[PDB]
């Protein structure tokens, strides 16, 4: 009776998300789906015990099977190290997994017709693709104490004459100086990932750069994106009635606000980092934002919620108090992974189920059963009442009932 | 009869704005106000004629008198040179003026209750202060052909104990690399104007940086602001129930969208550049954006519309077709400069008039009299009708008539 799932790699998470994650699998997924499951505990204690070995093993497994579903994880910081008595301040699991996999992360927010938005106009998804190999985020930056000259020099490994340029001469006073770089392969991968995501998504693609100011530096991003599109992707875009274009960031943010959504926006690392929160904020609650990591090959996908472990809610949970935490992003992480898995294996039965969960989840909210954060959006935070929303367990049950009804209705 | 304005420096502009500028003076300012007016023609032909000396003359004049009102001016490009056959491809007047004055531009958009905005929340002005001296805008960026080592080095004037930082070593392939800088002094001036602007306008001030990512580079911006504030302005802010705080940029944009407005936002040069276009748009039409330039001393202010010459409208006007160009931003430049002059001169009447002009202009729109861009905001772009909006002359005349009535009751 159960659908045959295929092979998926599952990673367990931390805190509030973890409680939901088990609930989602137990009620939402396992009953109707059978999977070959490779399960890794990415929970902070396990990561600590394994030395972060488990995280690496999990990342490798995703490469082997091509599909990953992930739960939000604690990212170690000094307070955390003190809290868990961690052996070391471990690197973020997302950071490690992205590093091993390569590929680019795209964040999109689920939209419900009843829920209001900061930007009312945005009735279609806007998807942000983030280039996380950073010009800014891998940068050499320093204070300039006193008058001096700052120069940037490139030395060819081939023994060709080295080139030096004077960034500035500080005749008087202090300054701040910086050096940053980007590499052709990362940009190339990023472009390949974005074209493929758009083609898979069904939406048009834009890339934003301040290429007018920084003709050489941002020109490479623009040039690489054009070169790849023309050579390998354009006809497919033509067939699917969608396009790729390059936009200046000032134009794009303004255009995006005016716009009704429905596009994939490809962002350089600084732009993407700013964009990811802002776009989510415009849409609504963080509970409704999902992250998908997509590699250049297009075979491999890792899906996780955009939001974190939701510690503030979890603390209430520990205290024995009631919580209303949104599972939609976490639920959607599963559905997206399943859909890709269905896509790779050409499994319609799985594909149908992954969609069915998404429809059910939206339909339930659209009918007025929702977590507190959603309720706040319609009411306003002050005006929300306990009757207005379901608690975390209550919402999942309503979702479970609906999922059962929906699937049965489909049969026949 | 006529209020005594005091000394003002007025610069004529180009194209459509120039036509409006004459209309504003003729029907709005001159009848009720008498000024010591020093007038420079920044219109493109005159600028070409004088080799752009006049643009320099105006900037020097503003420093002397402390107040300038500016019409939008054409900034030359290869296309422009052919059209006017100019001798040289002249640099932008704002840039020339800005360089001579020093100072930081602040962009404020007028708010009308009737007009819808992309962000539902904003009911209060958000003012963006932009740091023109640029790390990005004065940077050396180069393509990297092949495997190489890229390094950034600082050498002290004495030449002792230089530091070398290796940005990257390209083992395989090619990339782009860049180096950028900023000045302690430029940042210091930028901070001073922003603080003075906040105190002057009675709003809280926020400075945004990526200091978590770029601790040394961003932090200086962050450090200089706190140090100046703690030393000089903090006491004044507390008296006025006002505060200054620093935000990470992602936090600031998200917080701003959720916000209702009412703050001054100080921006890094790249951040400001992105902010200016979007923020005006989020509020409404570009015709509603004004662009004051304020020096660190706080004595000296320059007022102009945020928008350009509006040539697309101008071409239609030339063709004999109908035009609906918003004068609100241009009108406000006059009002805001005058408000500064009144402050400097302690003139109650000049101060009263400037507010009345602003008040009337908002009131007129709120009543449902407007140009096409605003009507588009209310009705949606494709649903606008001729009945909805007033033509550029129609609007100005209504403003003149409404202003006269408003002034009349004061008497
Ligand atoms: N995907 C990942 O692996 C990520 C993990 N993290 C980790 O999360 C931990 C703590 O995260 P934090 O910084 O607090 O940010 P979170 O992503 O947990 O979000 C914090 C706040 O956002 C709102 N929120 C987020 N998700 C939900 C949800 N599902 N339902 C309802 N409200 C939600 C809540 O607002 P309110 O305050 O109103 O309750 C909550 O207080 C950190 O260890 C961090 O490392 C962080 C980012 C990404
Ligand atoms: N402060 C200054 O001196 C500035 C001058 N300029 C100069 O202006 C010239 C042309 O600038 P351009 O790039 O066309 O941009 P503009 O600022 O002139 O405006 C461009 C578009 O914005 C809309 N718009 C702007 N002002 C108004 C208004 N008052 N009422 C209604 N709509 C308005 C119009 O949109 P629509 O097309 O929908 O009508 C117009 O087509 C250039 O030479 C440029 O250098 C530019 C920027 C600043
Ligand atoms: C008007 C809005 N400003 C703003 N909006 C965006 N993106 C929005 C999510 C959207 F595109 F949807 F409008 N991005 C930026 C920004 C700033 C600095 C650097 C970069 Cl790269 N981007 N600023 C504010 F402030 F009101 F929120
Ligand atoms: Mg589609
Ligand atoms: Mg208790």
Curated annotation (Swiss-Prot), chain B:
GO annotation, biological process: 2-oxoglutarate metabolic process; female gonad development; glutathione metabolic process; glyoxylate cycle; isocitrate metabolic process; NADP metabolic process; NADPH regeneration; regulation of phospholipid biosynthetic process
PTM: Acetylation at Lys-372 dramatically reduces catalytic activity.
EC number: 1.1.1.42
Cofactors demanded by this protein: Mg(2+); Mn(2+)
Sequence positions bearing Phosphoserine: 387
Domain of life where this protein originates: Eukaryota
Residues with PTM N6-acetyllysine: 79, 222, 231, 241, 319
Site (Critical for catalysis): 137, 210
Annotated protein name in UniProt: Isocitrate dehydrogenase [NADP] cytoplasmic
Gene expressing this chain: IDH1
